[PDB]
C-alpha cells in the first residue's frame, strides 16, 4: 500500500455525503420541496382556469453521481432536482415558467428565488435547486432548460442525464471508486481554500468535468499475488499537474496584460465552459492554488516522517484529513 493510502481513505470516508438511493434523508428533504411545487402549482394556476402542468422529476448534480461532500461547519447541503413540465417551450417563455415555480414555492421555508439557471428554494442548512425543463415531445424533441432572470433568457438544449451517465461510465468498479474519490478531494480542497471570496471558487461541476477529460488511475498489482492497492495521492498528483498544464495565458485589451484560464468544457450540450464566469484574477488565484497543492502532493511523497506528508497535505484539505503523531 502506498504511503498516505490509509489516510486518504479516512479523509474520504470523514468528507463524503451518501448518494439519492442510499441516503433517505436527503430523498425526503428533495420530496418535500417537489410536494410543495405540485401544492402550490395548483394555486398559482387557480387564476389561470385549468388544471396545473404535470411534471416528472429526477435527481441532478453530486447527490445523482455519487461524488457528493459534507459541507463544511455552517455550510449548506446542495440538494439538484430536475422537473420536466408537461409543456411545448415554443408557448412559454422560460422566466414565465420558472415564475410559476417560484411563485409555487413562495411560503416554502425561507423564500424561493429565479436564478439564472433554476429556481433556488432556501430551508434550513440547504437549498434545492430546481432546474426547470419543457417536455421534449411538446418541443420538437429537445431538452431545453428555461435561462434567464427579470434582469435580461431562452429555452438552452439541456443534457444533464447525459453528463451523469458519463461520469457513471468512465470507468467501472473499484477504479471509477478511485475517480469518485479525487473529485470529492478537491471539493473538500475547494471549501477550505477558497472560504474568503465563495465567488472566486472553481464550480463543483467544473472540478467533476475537469476529472472526466483528465483523471487517471494510479494502482499497482504485485506481481505475486496480483493483489491491488490504489495510490490516491498519486493520482491526485497526476490530475492536478494535467489541470495546470491546460491553463492558457488570456490576454485582457481592459487591463493590458493577460490572465491564465483554465477552460473546461462541459461533454455533452451544451458544451460550455463551465469556468467562463471566473475572472481572470480568480483564475490566477485558482492557478497559484492548485499550484501550492500540487507542491504539497509532491512534498509528501518523499517526507522520512508520515507525520509530516499528512501535515503537508492537512494544510490543503483542512481538519478532516488525518494527521498521525510522530
Ligand atoms: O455550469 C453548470 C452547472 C450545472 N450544470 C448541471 O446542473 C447540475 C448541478 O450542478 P451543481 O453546480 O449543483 O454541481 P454538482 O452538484 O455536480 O456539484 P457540487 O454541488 O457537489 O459541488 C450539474 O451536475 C449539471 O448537470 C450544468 O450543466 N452546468
Ligand atoms: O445547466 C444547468 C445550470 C445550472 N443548474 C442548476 O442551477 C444552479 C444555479 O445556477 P445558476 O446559473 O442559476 O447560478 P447564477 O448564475 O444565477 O448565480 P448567481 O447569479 O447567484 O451568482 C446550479 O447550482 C445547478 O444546480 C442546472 O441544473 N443546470
Given at each position: 500500500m502506498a504511503p498516505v493510502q490509509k489516510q486518504f481513505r479516512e479523509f474520504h470516508d470523514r468528507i463524503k455525503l451518501a448518494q439519492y438511493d442510499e441516503n433517505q434523508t436527503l430523498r425526503d428533504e428533495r420530496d418535500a420541496v417537489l410536494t410543495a411545487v405540485r401544492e402550490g402549482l395548483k394555486k398559482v394556476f387557480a387564476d389561470r382556469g385549468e388544471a396545473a402542468p404535470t411534471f416528472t422529476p429526477f435527481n441532478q448534480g453530486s447527490y445523482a453521481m455519487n461524488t457528493g461532500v459534507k459541507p463544511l461547519e455552517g455550510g449548506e447541503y446542495d440538494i439538484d432536482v430536475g422537473i420536466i413540465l408537461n409543456?411545448?417551450?415554443?408557448?412559454?417563455?422560460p422566466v414565465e415558467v420558472k415564475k410559476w415555480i417560484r411563485d409555487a414555492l413562495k411560503?416554502?421555508?425561507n423564500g424561493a428565488e429565479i436564478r439564472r439557471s433554476c429556481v433556488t428554494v432556501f430551508k434550513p442548512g440547504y437549498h434545492v435547486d430546481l432546474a426547470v425543463y419543457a417536455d421534449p415531445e411538446l418541443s420538437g424533441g429537445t431538452l431545453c432548460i428555461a435561462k434567464g432572470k427579470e434582469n435580461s433568457r431562452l429555452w438552452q438544449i439541456s443534457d444533464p442525464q447525459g453528463f451523469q451517465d458519463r461520469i457513471a461510465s468512465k470507468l467501472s468498479g473499484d477504479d471509477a471508486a478511485q475517480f469518485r474519490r479525487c473529485i470529492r478531494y478537491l471539493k473538500r480542497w475547494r471549501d477550505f481554500r477558497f472560504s474568503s471570496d465563495g465567488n472566486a471558487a472553481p464550480l463543483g461541476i467544473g472540478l467533476t468535468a475537469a476529472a472526466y477529460w483528465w483523471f487517471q488511475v494510479s494502482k499497482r498489482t504485485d506481481p505475486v499475488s496480483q493483489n491491488v492497492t490504489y495510490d490516491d495521492r498519486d493520482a491526485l498528483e497526476q490530475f492536478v499537474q494535467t489541470m495546470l498544464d491546460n491553463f492558457h495565458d488570456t490576454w485582457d485589451s481592459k487591463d493590458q496584460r493577460s490572465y491564465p484560464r483554465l477552460t473546461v468544457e462541459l461533454?455533452?450540450?451544451?458544451?460550455?465552459?463551465?469556468?467562463?464566469?471566473?475572472?481572470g484574477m480568480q483564475m490566477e488565484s485558482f492557478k497559484s492554488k492548485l499550484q501550492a497543492l500540487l507542491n504539497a502532493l509532491k512534498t509528501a511523497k518523499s517526507r522520512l516522517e508520515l507525520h509530516d506528508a499528512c501535515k503537508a497535505l492537512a494544510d490543503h484539505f483542512?481538519?478532516?484529513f488525518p494527521v498521525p503523531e510522530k
Open positions: 409543456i411545448a417551450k415554443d408557448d412559454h417563455d411560503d416554502y421555508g461533454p455533452v450540450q451544451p458544451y460550455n465552459d463551465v469556468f467562463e464566469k471566473m475572472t483542512g481538519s478532516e
